[PDB]
Structure formats: structure tokens, C-alpha cells
Design a protein around this nucleic acid. Structure first.
Ligand SMILES: C[C@H]1O[C@H](O[C@H]2[C@H](O)[C@@H](O)[C@@H](O)[C@H](O)[C@@H]2O)[C@@H](N)C[C@@H]1NC(=N)C(=O)O
Ligand SMILES: [K+]
Ligand SMILES: [K+]
Ligand SMILES: [K+]
Ligand SMILES: [K+]
Ligand SMILES: [K+]
Ligand SMILES: [K+]
Ligand SMILES: [Mg+2]
Ligand SMILES: [Mg+2]
Ligand SMILES: [Mg+2]
Ligand SMILES: [Mg+2]
Ligand SMILES: [Mg+2]
Ligand SMILES: [Mg+2]
Ligand SMILES: [Mg+2]
Ligand SMILES: [Mg+2]
Ligand SMILES: [Mg+2]
Ligand SMILES: [Mg+2]
Ligand SMILES: [Mg+2]
Ligand SMILES: [Mg+2]
Ligand SMILES: [Mg+2]
Lengths: 100, 102, 88, 117, 52, 65
RNA sequence: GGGGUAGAAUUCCAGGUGUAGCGGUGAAAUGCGUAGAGAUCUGGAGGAAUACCGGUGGCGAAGGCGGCCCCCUGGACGAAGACUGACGCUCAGGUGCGAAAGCGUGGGGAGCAAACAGGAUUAGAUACCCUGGUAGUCCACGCCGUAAACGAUGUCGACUUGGAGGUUGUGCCGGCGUGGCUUCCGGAGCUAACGCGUUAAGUCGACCGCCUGGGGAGUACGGCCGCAAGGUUAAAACUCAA
RNA sequence: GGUAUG
């Protein structure tokens, strides 16, 4: 329904990111879901500390999808303790253009 | 250093303050009772009780009507207070009976 | 609210056209669908008082449309209340 | 002692008092001095001047640590905000950083009732 | 107005991080509200500071 | 407010900066109004009064010109 | 409506540093602190509330509603059409919603705080002020049904000069229109006056509610409702000449 | 700091 999943990763487990991406984006396409964007910004400085950490690894997934898969992605992000913080927004349309 | 507890041990016995209740010659019964309940409360806490009776104008010319009131209070507070002073005369326009706890 | 598809189904089924959105049958049908759907909502969300006021306006608006049709044309009325499964 | 050299001057400037604690950069306390400890009593504590004196007595309690640079962390609405800082400069310590660190509660907790005075 | 467009958002916050009034920046009311939501999403992702 | 003292600038100048920094951020004004509870009716009352006064300026700073 | 989540702050807990005060007031004292407080730093626990944005801004029938995110969901407005064909307006009784306090059962409990305890002030001070502090404030479910629940202004429709704004659509070429909501001023008119004034308190029409001197009294009695607190309906004698 | 009472 045009989501926009950002998620930040514990910068140690930046190793795990390209694998974790696939595992999620596979479950999207598993139920008909587009991936209109995927922009790994990579390691960045947090503007404030989050559970000790002063940097973290950001990823941006603009995703058309059903609702059930987005719910499953939230449970994954919750338990996957490498993921420090996630935000699933909604968007009106799909966004393919590049973001800073 | 340990003056803190010495100061407390001093203060844990209270200084007797003097509470003032003021009557008039024509103080009515219910209002008298309120003032008496005040005095009872004061004396049971161990405070002295400067009971005053203020005359006004020509009420001066009927001193004994005032004196009656002070006598009444003494009698009512008999098994509780002791008269440290009773007024002989009207000093100014007042008559000050100091009571004190037994 | 009903989806554009769910609407356009009901309009086709009860209309005399796909232009025929105005018909009392369509209007009552549309209202009956959305009324029925919301029975789910208010079983879960029993304290959603503000939403329930919207529901009662649908119930009320339906009752009025049915009473209009009952006196305008009783044949159309009897069919409609069986098709939609309405008591009165 | 360990010649701290660079330390931190936390000025708790309340409406009634002015605490002045000098700490190291890790926020371990070296020496402290309140306006209420500086002779002033009652609402003479709550003066700019009593803050000035409190700073000076704190300065002279961290003589042994031989501090030279200070970070000033003022906290609160008190009269002894600027007065404390001016004193620390004149006391010889060079001021690298002055920061307001007054708490604002981003809403939080219900304050006490207004005084009907 | 984009929560990710930190360069644009930085024009509408103060040094301390607080959102600037539209009376100051002369922004239109519709955009001030979009801008406010943007700034608040940024802050959650730690792309802008809440404070300091 | 993070007035770090710059190179070759006097203390008194840096303290004026710290004041203007705090006076604009409005830290002391904030602490004052959070000292005691103001119930919402009182908050709204003051907000309306401020608005009427601000309005009464605009129809008297002009309305005269 | 539901669920999640974030940062700030307060309290507490555990440490580190540190040492004699802190706190409070008009002034004090109660209190806290050498069993090491307050201050400062680190970490943890927990509850409640969302700074700035924020606006005579917005939304809602009213009560009311303010971090962010999702889920479920109601209403409003505009643009062109297309469709139904008076299907409308109002509404006694009825039904529901309804701030806060309060009540029941069970959770929770940071902060705040009726009661209460103490310290003061005082002629007294059952207060205001200070230190504390329980119910409560929060959650769930159930009750209660009242507020200056106010625009002190019932709902719907039509008509009747203007000015300055705000907010939210939209058409056309920053300008020129055209809708919705809204703040302020003012014309005619209205009004006892104050004022209201196209969002009317103007000019009219439909329907409903309500008033008939003050006090007695929103009380008594009765009924209905309520676990209770009470609520609702609602008099009279009498007395006054306002 | 409470301006009890001509
Ligand atoms: C300050 C006092 O103010 C009020 O009493 C006033 C009285 O003290 C005299 O000044 C005059 O008779 C005034 O006309 C009265 O209004 C009255 N509210 C009681 C107050 N006093 C106290 N609370 C107190 O003394 O204590
Ligand atoms: K997580
Ligand atoms: K009817
Ligand atoms: K409590
Ligand atoms: K007149
Ligand atoms: K009468
Ligand atoms: K009754
Ligand atoms: Mg509205
Ligand atoms: Mg909506
Ligand atoms: Mg309540
Ligand atoms: Mg309860
Ligand atoms: Mg308290
Ligand atoms: Mg209190
Ligand atoms: Mg009423
Ligand atoms: Mg109002
Ligand atoms: Mg009324
Ligand atoms: Mg109606
Ligand atoms: Mg007007
Ligand atoms: Mg009238
Ligand atoms: Mg009654």
C-alpha cells in the first residue's frame, strides 16, 4: 500500500545487512510486493546516542506490499536485536526518485 | 559536628507561648463556648492564656458586668488552668487575666 | 468506507445500469454493505463512540430510504429487503 | 591530587541558593561551595553577590588541583548565574566553554500548585 | 517536504534544535505543519537532534 | 546554548554572547512558567488575552498609521 | 478506537567523586544531612505527560481532541459530471453520548495532592505560607449524568449595504475569479441600554424547549433512576414591596 | 511580610 521502511542497524552487524535485506525483500516479493526503491545510506553518525551507539547503518526501503507482510517485517525487526530502530511509514504513491 | 542533635534535644521541649483570647462584656453564649474551646485547646497543649476583656465607651461604667465574664471563664477552666494573674482594675480599657496550665 | 470495487459491484447488482447510482435500491444496498462491514469494527472497538454515530446515521438513512420505497413501490420494496436480507 | 588542569564548574543557580561544584572532565567532584556556606543566611543567600563569594571560595578549594581551563555548566534561573561566572574568570581560571544545562521537561511531571501569596 | 532532506530542515530549526515559528521564517501554514512532522520524524531516526 | 569561547575574544564579549544565546532560546522564561501548575483553562485564558492585546495593537499601530 | 514506540524531565535504587550543609520563607521553623546529604558523573527501575511546532490555527453534535508510527474507523469540503426523484424540516415521549469530582471490583502509583500530621502567621487562623502526606489523579470493566456542560444566544430554510484578516479547496492568465470554515470592525435595521450587525440580537417562515415579582426553593411530598453520593420531575403555606 | 477598629 506504498510503505517506506527505514531501519537502522547496530554498526558491528553492518556485516549482516546485505543478507538481512534479501531475507526481507524476498518475503515482500513472496506476496506480490514491489520494491520501488532500496537505498543503503550505510554507516552514519547518530545525532544523539542510542543504547551506547554513536553510529549506525541506515537502510531505506520504499515498498508496495500487502499489509500482512509488513506486519511480519515488524515482528522480525522487533526480535532481530541487530536492528536498533525501525520506522514503517505509509506513502500515498510509489517513490522511485533518489533521496539524499 | 554533632551540634545538630544537641539543637534537636533543646527544641524537643517546647517554649511556652502566650495565646490571647479577647472577650467583651456582652459576648453571647455560643460565641463564649467557641472561645472556651479555644482556651481548652491552648492549655492542653501547655500554652499560657492571656484572657482579655475590652470595655468600649460607657461599658466602662459597668465594670462588674465584665468582671462576671472573667470570673465565669476562671470557673469553667478551673480543673485545667491556674490563675497567674487576675485584674483588679481596668488598665486602659482592658482587664487581663493570665491563666496558665496546671 | 467501501472500496471503489465493492461499491461498483453493488451498483451493478442493484442498479438498472452502472450510471444508476441514485436508485433507492443501490442506496439501500450500499448502506447495508457498509452497515454490515462495521459490525466487525464495533465488536472489537466497543468504545469507538464517535464512529458509532456515523453508523447510526447509516442505519437511520437506510430506514428512511426503505420507508420511501415501501410507499412509492411495494414490489421493489419486497424484493430488495429479501435480496439484502432485511427484516423490515 | 593530580593537577586536573582542565575541569568543569557546575553552577546550580536556584532562586534561593547557588551551589558551585568544580569537577574533572569525567564529572568527579574536586571541591564545592554554596552561597549559604559563605556567611550569607536566609534570602541574602539568594543574591548575585553571595554567588560571587561562593565562586571565590570554590576557586580557593581547587587551588591544590591547579586548574587553568574551566567548562562552565550553568543550571537554573537563579540570580547567581552570570555573577558566578564573572567571579571564575577574575579568579584566574580561563573559561573555554559556557553551556546552559537547565532541564526543560518536554511536555512531563505536574508542577506544584501556584502560591496564593 | 521530506524528513530525509536534512539540509532543507536545518534551515527551520534553531541552534538548540527547536522548530522555528512560521511568524519568523515566513512559511505558509500548510508547509509549517508538513515541516513540523518532517522534523519530528527526523528526530526519531536520529537524523536531527532533539536537544543540545 | 553552547557558547564555546573563540580564540582571541575577551571574556566579557563571550558572556554577552551567552546571554543573547539564552535570552533567544528562552530558557529562563521557560523555567518560570514551569515553576507552578497552570490548569488548562488558565493557559487558554492567557493565550486569548495575549491575542486580543496583539490584535488591539494592529488596530491601533495602524488605524492611525 | 486499538496497538506499538521515542526523546526530555521528576522520583527512587545502585555505584563513583566529594564534604558540610541542603531545603524552605516576608522572616522562620518543621524536614533532610557525617549511617555522608545537597552538588556532580555513570548505570538501572518505574510511572505520568508530550517542550519547540502552536497560531483568536484545525477537527468534532456537544463534552472534548495535541510526540511519532501503523492498524481499524466517522465526518467535512471542492471540481466537473452522472444518477434517485420531495425520499424533506422539526421533534413531546424515547434512545444514546456527556468535563471534573465521586462510587464498585481489580490493577498501578513517578509527579501532584482533598483529608490528615507537623512548622508558622495571628487577637484567634479549624485558612492563606512552609515540610510532609493518604484517597484521588493513571489503567480495565461497570456505575454516576452533573458544571459559568457558555456564544449565558434551540434546530432548519430564505432574504438584506460594506471594510480588514485568517484558514482550506478550486478555475483562469504574481494577478484575476469562485466555494467551505473562521477572527475583527462597522452600515441599515434592531435593542432598555450595553451591544448585535450576512456566522444577526436585522427581515421572515417551520417545528420544538422554556419564562410569568423577590425570598421560601430547584427545597418538601410523591414518582422514576442510582450501590451510594445523589440526580431528575417539582409545589405550597408564609413573608417582603420590592 | 496581613492597611483588626474613625
Ligand atoms: C489581610 C486581611 O484582608 C482582609 O481583611 C481586611 C482587614 O484586615 C482590614 O484591612 C479591612 O477591614 C479590610 O476591609 C478587610 O478586607 C481579610 N481577607 C482577612 C485578611 N487577614 C488575614 N488573613 C490575616 O490577618 O491573617
Ligand atoms: K529491535
Ligand atoms: K417524528
Ligand atoms: K499517594
Ligand atoms: K446611550
Ligand atoms: K410570593
Ligand atoms: K424525591
Ligand atoms: Mg468546528
Ligand atoms: Mg480520516
Ligand atoms: Mg474521573
Ligand atoms: Mg476507583
Ligand atoms: Mg506535596
Ligand atoms: Mg501543601
Ligand atoms: Mg443544570
Ligand atoms: Mg467558552
Ligand atoms: Mg443555559
Ligand atoms: Mg434534529
Ligand atoms: Mg459589530
Ligand atoms: Mg433582545
Ligand atoms: Mg432535590
Amino acid at each position: 500500500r506504498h510503505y517506506e521502511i527505514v531501519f537502522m542497524v547496530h554498526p558491528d552487524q553492518s556485516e549482516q545487512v546485505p543478507g538481512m535485506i534479501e531475507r526481507y525483500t524476498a518475503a515482500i516479493t513472496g506476496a506480490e510486493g514491489k520494491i520501488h526503491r532500496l537505498e543503503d545510506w550505510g554507516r552514519r553518525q547518530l545525532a544523539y546516542p542510542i543504547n551506547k551507539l554513536h553510529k549506525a547503518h541506515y537502510v531505506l526501503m520504499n515498498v508496495e506490499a500487502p499489509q500482512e507482510v509488513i506486519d511480519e517485517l515488524e515482528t522480525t525487526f522487533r526480535f532481530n536485536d541487530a536492528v536498533i530502530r525501525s520506522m514503517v511509514m505509509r506513502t500515498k504513491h510509489a517513490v522511485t526518485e533518489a533521496s539524499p | 559536628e554533632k551540634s545538630k542533635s544537641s539543637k534537636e534535644q533543646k527544641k524537643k521541649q517546647k517554649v511556652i507561648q502566650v495565646k490571647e483570647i479577647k472577650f467583651r462584656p456582652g459576648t453571647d453564649e455560643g460565641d463564649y463556648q467557641v472561645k472556651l474551646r479555644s482556651l481548652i485547646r491552648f492549655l492542653e497543649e501547655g500554652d499560657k492564656a492571656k484572657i482579655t476583656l475590652r470595655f468600649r465607651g460607657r461599658e466602662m461604667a459597668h465594670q462588674q458586668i465584665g468582671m462576671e465574664v472573667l470570673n465565669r471563664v476562671k470557673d469553667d477552666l478551673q480543673e485545667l488552668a491556674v490563675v497567674e494573674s487576675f485584674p483588679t482594675k481596668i488598665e486602659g480599657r482592658q482587664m487581663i487575666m493570665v491563666l496558665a496550665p496546671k | 468506507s467501501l472500496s471503489t470495487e465493492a461499491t461498483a459491484k453493488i451498483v451493478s447488482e442493484f442498479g438498472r445500469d452502472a450510471n444508476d447510482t441514485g436508485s433507492t435500491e443501490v442506496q439501500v444496498a450500499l448502506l447495508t454493505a457498509q452497515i454490515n462491514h462495521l459490525q466487525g469494527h464495533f465488536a472489537e472497538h466497543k468504545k469507538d463512540h464517535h464512529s458509532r454515530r456515523g453508523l447510526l446515521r447509516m442505519v437511520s438513512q437506510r430506514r428512511k430510504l426503505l420507508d420511501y420505497l415501501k410507499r412509492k413501490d411495494v414490489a421493489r420494496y419486497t424484493q430488495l429487503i429479501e435480496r439484502l436480507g432485511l427484516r423490515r | 591530587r593530580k593537577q586536573v588542569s582542565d575541569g568543569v564548574a557546575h553552577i546550580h543557580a536556584s532562586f534561593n541558593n547557588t551551589i558551585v561544584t568544580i569537577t574533572d572532565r569525567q564529572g568527579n567532584a574536586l571541591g564545592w561551595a554554596t552561597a549559604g556556606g559563605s556567611g550569607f543566611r536566609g534570602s541574602r543567600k539568594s543574591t548575585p553577590f553571595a554567588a560571587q563569594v561562593a565562586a571565590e571560595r570554590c576557586a580557593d578549594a581547587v587551588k591544590e588541583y591547579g586548574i587553568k581551563n574551566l567548562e562552565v555548566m550553568v543550571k537554573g534561573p537563579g540570580p547567581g548565574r552570570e555573577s558566578t561566572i564573572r567571579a571564575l574568570n577574575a579568579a584566574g581560571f580561563r573559561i573555554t566553554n559556557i553551556t546552559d544545562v537547565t532541564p526543560i521537561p518536554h511536555x512531563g511531571c505536574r508542577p506544584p500548585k501556584k502560591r496564593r501569596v | 517536504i521530506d524528513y530525509k532532506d536534512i539540509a532543507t530542515l536545518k534551515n527551520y530549526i534553531t541552534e538548540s534544535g527547536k522548530i522555528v515559528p512560521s511568524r519568523i521564517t515566513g512559511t505558509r501554514a500548510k508547509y509549517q505543519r508538513q515541516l513540523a512532522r518532517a522534523i519530528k520524524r527526523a528526530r526519531y531516526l536520529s537524523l536531527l537532534p532533539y536537544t543540545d | 546554548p553552547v557558547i564555546k569561547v573563540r580564540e582571541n575574544e575577551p571574556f566579557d564579549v563571550a558572556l554577552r554572547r551567552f546571554k543573547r544565546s539564552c535570552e533567544k532560546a528562552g530558557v529562563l522564561a521557560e523555567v518560570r512558567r514551569r515553576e507552578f501548575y497552570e490548569k488548562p483553562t488558565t493557559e487558554r485564558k492567557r493565550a486569548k488575552a495575549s491575542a486580543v492585546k496583539r490584535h488591539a495593537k494592529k488596530l491601533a499601530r495602524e488605524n492611525a498609521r
